[PDB]
Amino acid sequence: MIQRTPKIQVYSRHPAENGKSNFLNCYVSGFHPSDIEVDLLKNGERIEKVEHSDLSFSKDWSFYLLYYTEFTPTEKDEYACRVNHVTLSQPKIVKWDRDM
Amino acid sequence: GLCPLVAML
Amino acid sequence: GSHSMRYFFTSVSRPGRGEPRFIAVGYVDDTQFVRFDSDAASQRMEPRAPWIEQEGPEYWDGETRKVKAHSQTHRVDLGTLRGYYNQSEAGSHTVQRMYGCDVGSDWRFLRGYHQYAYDGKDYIALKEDLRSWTAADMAAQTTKHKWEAAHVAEQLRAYLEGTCVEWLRRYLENGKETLQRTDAPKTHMTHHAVSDHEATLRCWALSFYPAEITLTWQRDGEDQTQDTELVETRPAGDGTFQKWVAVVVPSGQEQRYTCHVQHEGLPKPLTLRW
Incomplete structure (x- = not known):
């Protein structure tokens, strides 16, 4: 069984400005197998009703998915995305750096 | 549109 | 320039209980336009681009008929491969498939594809000339010979050089606002x-x-x-x-x-x- 760990990218759709509506993305790619858990966090709590793209894959057969939700940056809130996968000893959490 | 064939391995 | 229509199919066996998870997505270039998910409620091919919504019910019934037939095929194929590779019924395994076609700037057929992976590795693929097969290993040599004996390449070619590009042409026109922008x-x-x-x-x-x-x-x-x-x-x-x-x-x-x-x-x- 070939196994590949997910590459993770957490970022906003639009340039981030406090108090302005935006979209928070977690883009996971280059992974195998395809079963994967991906959550978006606000101050460590799971955001509910995050949506995601339909599973697809690259020329090298590695999968990719986009998870995303509407949010409003503040100065006070922290966001991250949390990915679990068979290749990971525990959930990987990547913090969102604005204008990352 | 999809291909109507799909042969099995 | 050129344009491509691509279909991506993923089937994952769930040996714990039930049948494989099957996910199919259709693309024109980098735009998704259709999807099917065995775990969604519709059990229909569904629209993912406004320009595909112009197709009437016959298109959706046709696409649904075919996409479900593809699902069964992948289901059978996972069974087949587990046998070829002497794997137990206890592991989860994956079949991936991609096919489609490109047209050039002249709007004519330019290239075609049809390729197959097992558990994230090359299995069998149609070569660039659409007449012969690249088999990665000895298991795939079985598929190669069966498919050559049943003239599958020819049938596939007729689609990729024909009806595949006709659809692509149609989609490019109907979605020209976005697809050709x-x-x-x-x-x-x-x-x-x-x-x-x-x-x-x-x-x-x-x-x-x-x-x-x-x-x-x-x-x-x-x-x-x-x-x-x-x-x-x-x-x-x-x-x-x-x-x-x-x-x-x-x-x-x-x-x-x-x-x-x-x-x-x-x-x-x-x-x-x-």
Whole structure:
């Protein structure tokens, strides 16, 4: 069984400005197998009703998915995305750096 | 549109 | 330029209980337009682009009939492969398939594809001439001989060179507002000090379509890769893509560095200076 760990990218759709509506993305790619858990966090709590793209894959057969939700940056809130996968000893959490 | 064939391995 | 229609199929066995999870997505270039998910409620091929919504019920019934037939086939195929590879019924295994076609700028058939992976590895693939098979291993040699004996290549070719391109042509027309539009990257450069003596220049490409793009730094007219950082091209979520590349430079020396952007939606490459 070939196994590949997910590459993770957490970022906003639009340039981030406090108090302005935006979209928070977690883009996971280059992974195998395809079963994967991906959550978006606000101050460590799971955001509910995050949506995601339909599973697809690259020329090298590695999968990719986009998870995303509407949010409003503040100065006070922290966001991250949390990915679990068979290749990971525990959930990987990547913090969102604005204008990352 | 999809291909109507799909042969099995 | 050229345009492609691509179908991606993923089938994952669930030996704990029930049948395989099957996910099929259809693309024109970097735009998804149809999807099917065995775990969704409709059990229908569903629209994912406004321009595909112009197709009437006969299209959706046709696409649903075929997509379900594909599902059964992958289901059977996973069984078949577990046998070929002497695997127990206890593991979860994956079959992936991709096929489709490109048309050139002349709107005619340019290329066709049909390829198959087991558990994330090449299994069998139709060669560029659409007449013969590339079998990765001895298991695949069985598929190769069976398919050659049943003239599957010929049938596949007739689709890829025929009906495949007819659909692509139709979709390109009906969706011309978006499918044949190129969104040139909106570029800017940011500057931040990391010390008293050096700064980070980041050159951004935002909101471009299609996804293909080249971002490169130059120093005094020559490519520079040392002391650079980048991200892989990423979806913005609104159907466009994003990328940046950054370089760390001595404070005061910014004039030396240029960012170069190549994209289909740009008649000439762009050069950005700080």
